[PDB]
């Protein structure tokens, strides 16, 4: 396996598996500090899903919330985790998203997701790729089918991996006193692009469902 990413992705997935039990740990009808964030993020899933997917947003609530909150916790492990002293001879210790493979996995997941919706809910024989509006629109089918997953992934992946490198490229020259607005802009936009992959996934499901 590609170890340099997998080793740290294991402990980030451990953070995920613990947040899986955070649900069943504390029941609060009125959630005070911290859990109100959980309810607000559930509301955020409601927002993006009901806004873009359409009707069967709720069985896709899991599939959108997973990538959204996972980009959240991976931004956490990338920047906000104190990792100055730790040293690995296998490679840099930045984030789970350091490898292309995680983002192409999210890509294929979203792709087969809207393909699944468009094959089940619509007909099996033909879906939006079939050339109904104008029968000479096969280049549109080819291009969009070929470009959606990989660049869908690249949109997030580029910024996240770029900052994951830029942080150590900055510390290699100047200590942490200078790179901190860079950390700020990164922690700013890394959750936005999480939202972006989420809403574009949702829009592709809506395309499949229409």
């Amino acid at each position: 396996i590609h170890g340099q990413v997998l080793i740290t992705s294991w402990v980030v997935i451990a953070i995920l598996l613990g947040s899986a039990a955070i649900a069943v740990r504390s029941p609060q009808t009125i959630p005070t500090g911290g859990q109100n964030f959980f309810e607000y993020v559930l509301e955020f899933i409601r927002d993006v899903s009901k806004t873009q997917i359409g009707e069967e947003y709720r069985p896709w609530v899991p599939f959108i919330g997973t990538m959204f909150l996972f980009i959240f916790v991976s931004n956490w492990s990338g920047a906000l985790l104190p990792w100055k002293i730790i040293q690995l001879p296998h490679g840099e210790l930045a984030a789970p998203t350091n490898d292309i493979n995680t983002t192409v996995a999210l890509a294929l997941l979203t792709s087969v997701a809207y393909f699944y919706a468009g094959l089940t809910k619509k007909g099996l024989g033909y879906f939006g790729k079939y050339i109904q509006p104008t029968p000479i629109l096969l280049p549109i089918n080819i291009l969009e089918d070929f470009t959606k997953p990989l660049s869908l992934s690249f949109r997030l992946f580029g910024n996240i991996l770029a900052d994951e490198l830029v942080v150590v490229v900055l510390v290699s020259l100047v200590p942490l006193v200078v790179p901190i607005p860079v950390m700020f802009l990164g922690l700013f936009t890394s959750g936005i692009q999480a939202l972006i992959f989420a809403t574009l996934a949702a829009a592709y499901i809506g395309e499949s469902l229409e």
Binding site: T32, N36, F37, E39, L80, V177, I180, M183
Partner: peptide, 30 residues
């Protein structure tokens, strides 16, 4: 040092997010 300054400011940010959300849950409770 600057790591501590960053952690403190991010603690403040967690606090402002949590208290705005507490205000929302206060609306729901009322």
């Amino acid at each position: 040092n600057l790591s501590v300054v960053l952690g403190v400011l991010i603690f403040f940010g967690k606090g402002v997010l949590s208290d705005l959300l507490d205000n929302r849950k206060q609306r729901i409770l009322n």
